[PDB]
Design a protein around this ligand. Structure first.
Ligand SMILES: Nc1ncnc2c1ncn2[C@@H]1O[C@H](COP(=O)(O)O)[C@@H](O)[C@H]1O
Ligand SMILES: Nc1ncnc2c1ncn2[C@@H]1O[C@H](COP(=O)(O)O)[C@@H](O)[C@H]1O
Lengths: 143, 143
């Protein structure tokens, strides 16, 4: 009974209707961590696209990023920028940040597993946010 | 304004009232992945304690575990056991599986960051499930 089904691994994100494409919560490179933490606790979404001055995705900020900040032995306050998370990892340069609607479920799954990341930002031709794909969305496709 | 606050890093899980201690969804070492996947998609919890024949915690099964299974190049079906996830990692032997109510937030945070894990099972003296602590619970303590 193969897991995952080969006929669904070969279908695109668009075809499978996988991800969230409305009401996306996101932040800027100039956003302090206190704003992200407020979003996580009060708005309750799992990952935040981080966009530069042009609206282009340059990182994804997760709840684990906050915990990583909290564990730092150097002195921090919450007025630190979300871009300080980049000292621990670069989702961007490892090619495990973004994805496209036309990409296959197999491609997306291989990308998640590549860096052990829980989410990808769906972008357009200008790297501008269209949606988000998280492990929950993939699990709905895997059923 | 220090992040995290030192006066809350020194407090225990019990003292901070961090974690979920009722209505815990969990599975057995004999549980097939199809049962875990159904739980994730329909019951909608982030991590499942995996308990042996004696009710003792021997693993934690996460949504990423399913994605990891899905990416395997060898042939699988969903009748595989949740214990096949153990081929990718041992939360147990790395000491990043369990925690106790009396442990400090700083200890718990350092443990999460140690293996880059998103959750811990709160256990008793017999390694039996008392609750679960996930990144969301920690974020509520960090505010
Ligand atoms: N920043 C976000 N804004 C809006 N929806 C999101 C965001 N991050 C994740 N989601 C969606 O939240 C749902 C649950 O995802 P998760 O919280 O990872 O289980 C999924 O459908 C995601 O696509
Ligand atoms: N297996 C589980 N059974 C019950 N509650 C859970 C389980 N896993 C996580 N939770 C709780 O679900 C809430 C949201 O956690 P998370 O889904 O990781 O954001 C937290 O209060 C967790 O303690």
């Amino acid at each position: 009974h193969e897991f995952p089904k080969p006929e669904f691994m070969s279908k695109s994100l668009e075809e499978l209707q996988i991800g969230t494409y409305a009401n996306i919560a996101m932040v800027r490179t100039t956003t302090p961590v206190y704003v992200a933490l407020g979003i996580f606790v009060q708005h309750r979404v799992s990952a935040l696209p981080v966009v530069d001055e042009k609206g282009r995705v340059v990182d994804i900020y997760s709840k684990f990023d906050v915990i990583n900040l909290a564990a730092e032995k150097t002195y921090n306050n919450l007025d630190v920028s979300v871009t300080k998370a980049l000292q621990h990892r670069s989702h961007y340069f490892e090619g495990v940040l973004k994805c496209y609607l036309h990409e296959t479920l197999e491609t997306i799954i291989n990308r998640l597993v590549e860096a052990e990341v829980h989410g990808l930002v769906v972008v357009d031709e200008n790297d501008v946010v269209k949606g988000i794909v998280s492990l929950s969305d993939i699990l709905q496709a895997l059923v």
